[PDB]
Amino acid sequence: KLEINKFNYNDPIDGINVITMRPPRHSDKINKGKGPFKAFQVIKNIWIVPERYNFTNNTNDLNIPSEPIMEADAIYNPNYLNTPSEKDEFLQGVIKVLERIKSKPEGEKLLELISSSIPLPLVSNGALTLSDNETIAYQENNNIVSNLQANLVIYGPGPDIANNATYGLYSTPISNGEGTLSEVSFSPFYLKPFDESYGNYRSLVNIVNKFVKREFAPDPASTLMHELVHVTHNLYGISNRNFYYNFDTGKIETSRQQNSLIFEELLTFGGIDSKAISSLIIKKIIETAKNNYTTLISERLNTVTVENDLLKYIKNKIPVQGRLGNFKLDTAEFEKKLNTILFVLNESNLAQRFSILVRKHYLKERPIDPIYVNILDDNSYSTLEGFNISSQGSNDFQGQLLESSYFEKIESNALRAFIKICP
Numbered sequence: 221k222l223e224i225n226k227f228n229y230n231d232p233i234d235g236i237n238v239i240t241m242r243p244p245r246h247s248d249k250i251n252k253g254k255g256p257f258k259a260f261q262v263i264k265n266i267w268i269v270p271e272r273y274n275f276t277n278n279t280n281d282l283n284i285p286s287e288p289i290m291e292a293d294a295i296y297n298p299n300y301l302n303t304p305s306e307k308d309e310f311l312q313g314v315i316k317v318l319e320r321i322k323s324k325p326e327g328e329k330l331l332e333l334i335s336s337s338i339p340l341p342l343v344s345n346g347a348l349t350l351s352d353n354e355t356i357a358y359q360e361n362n363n364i365v366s367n368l369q370a371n372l373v374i375y376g377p378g379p380d381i382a383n384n385a386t387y388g389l390y391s392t393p394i395s396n397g398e399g400t401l402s403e404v405s406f407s408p409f410y411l412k413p414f415d416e417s418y419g420n421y422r423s424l425v426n427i428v429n430k431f432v433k434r435e436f437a438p439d440p441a442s443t444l445m446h447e448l449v450h451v452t453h454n455l456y457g458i459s460n461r462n463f464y465y466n467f468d469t470g471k472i473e474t475s476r477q478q479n480s481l482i483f484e485e486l487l488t489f490g491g492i493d494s495k496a497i498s499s500l501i502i503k504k505i506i507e508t509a510k511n512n513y514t515t516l517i518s519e520r521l522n523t524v525t526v527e528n529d530l531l532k533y534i535k536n537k538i539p540v541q542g543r544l545g546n547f548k549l550d551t552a553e554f555e556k557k558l559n560t561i562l563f564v565l566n567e568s569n570l571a572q573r574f575s576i577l578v579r580k581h582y583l584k585e586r587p588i589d590p591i592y593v594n595i596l597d598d599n600s601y602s603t604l605e606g607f608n609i610s611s612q613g614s615n616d617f618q619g620q621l622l623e624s625s626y627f628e629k630i631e632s633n634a635l636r637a638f639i640k641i642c643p
């Protein structure tokens with residue numbers, strides 16, 4: 221079955237699963253001189269890099285901002301993740317979260333999909349051939365030793381140490397059916413709480429109706445799975461973050477409006493807000509993806525004259541019929557796979573399978589200060605049950621209640637600078 225590789229941060233370089241990686245974004249001016257960074261292959265084609273994400277315009281400065289703060293629940297600390305002990309803690313936390321995801325069939329299948337679903341390569345001399353859209357470089361002493369396959373690289377957080385995000389490497393392949401390598405910025409220890417109505421908590425006797433909005437922490441496996449759903453969209457080349465869904469009209473628009481949400485986030489979160497999408501929208505999204513794939517099969521796949529392992533990978537990713545030089549899209553099987561990746565795979569549906577509580581709506585009504593939690597302590601967080609550990613009376617979402625003892629308060633200043641954890 222799918223295997224998760226364990227590592228300690230001080231494990232030696234071997235060129236197989238432990239490398240020093242040149243940043244995928246090394247050619248951008250903002251990234252001159254950065255790296256290489258120690259990287260660990262946790263699952264085939266999935267790499268963990270215990271470093272702050274610092275490689276795009278909006279993540280390049282990790283310092284406390286010098287401009288109006290427009291995320292009132294952010295926490296800044298440019299020194300987080302700069303010691304070997306914090307890097308090993310991060311590595312262990314990501315490994316443990318992935319082990320949790322693998323512990324249910326739906327999560328195992330998601331990880332298998334990301335591992336196997338390589339971007340569609342370019343063709344050279346009749347053969348599918350690898351590019352930097354499908355690989356990372358092992359750099360040693362300013363030489364490239366090898367190029368290793370990669371669909372996903374997971375880093376630590378950007379400037380806001382409690383934020384999470386996904387970035388596709390190349391912007392044309394992210395939305396034209398080819399797909400692109402993805403980077404994820406993830407924080408397993410610094411979490412942003414949310415509100416949900418609940419009635420099983422200590423309450424004053426003079427309160428008649430106890431069922432009210434209470435504060436909860438997310439399970440960081442749900443946080444990561446949300447980003448992994450974005451990754452799947454990026455690997456199949458079916459992202460488009462230029463569309464907004466307007467809740468007032470039920471229509472897709474190409475600019476943000478009063479009461480709207482980026483459509484990629486509406487789908488990736490799922491839940492109640494995706495249950496009333498019109499048939500017009502669904503048909504247009506499916507038809508766009510089908511047309512993009514039909515074009516790639518005729519213009520690129522049918523120029524392949526060399527059968528190699530990359531072609532094997534691609535036929536497992538893309539449902540096709542026919543023979544070399546004359547493939548056609550398998551419409552029924554492509555439709556089934558596409559509707560799974562767009563409408564079945566989402567944070568809300570996955571959380572239900574894991575007995576994890578998530579909020580009702582992607583957009584939160586108010587900011588709540590982040591907390592710190594040591595998820596490596598099995599008494600607080602287990603791979604099989606997360607925070608909601610039955611033997612400790614914390615089933616049925618109760619272990620996610622924010623007043624649980626393992627959720628530690630963080631003090632910050634008015635500029636949102638980290639001061640300390642209150643243990």
Ligand SMILES: [Zn+2]
Nearest residue numbers: 446450485488
């Ligand atoms: Zn998202």
